[PDB]
């Protein structure tokens, strides 16, 4: 549940929780090229690749 992303300079920001990531995503700060991962993930992935592979990003909330 520990999210990281790379900023435009390549610096790794985080960890952030699901709610913080979801808020920033809904506010529009993230393009689908933003590179994200949790500590437990294999590699950074752009949000768009996560969407193409899973149909959703894990931090998106819902029922």
């Amino acid at each position: 549940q520990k999210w990281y992303y790379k900023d435009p300079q390549g610096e790794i920001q985080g960890p952030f929780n699901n709610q913080e990531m979801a808020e920033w995503f809904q506010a529009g700060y993230f393009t689908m090229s933003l590179l994200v991962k949790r500590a437990c993930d294999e590699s950074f992935q752009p949000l768009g690749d996560i969407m193409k592979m899973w149909g959703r990003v894990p931090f998106s909330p819902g029922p």
């Binding site: 992303y5 900023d7 435009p8 300079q9 920001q13 952030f16 920033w24 506010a27 700060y29």
Partner: peptide, 9 residues
Amino acid sequence: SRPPPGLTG
């Protein structure tokens, strides 16, 4: 609400 560290909006 703060912006994401390393991003500005």
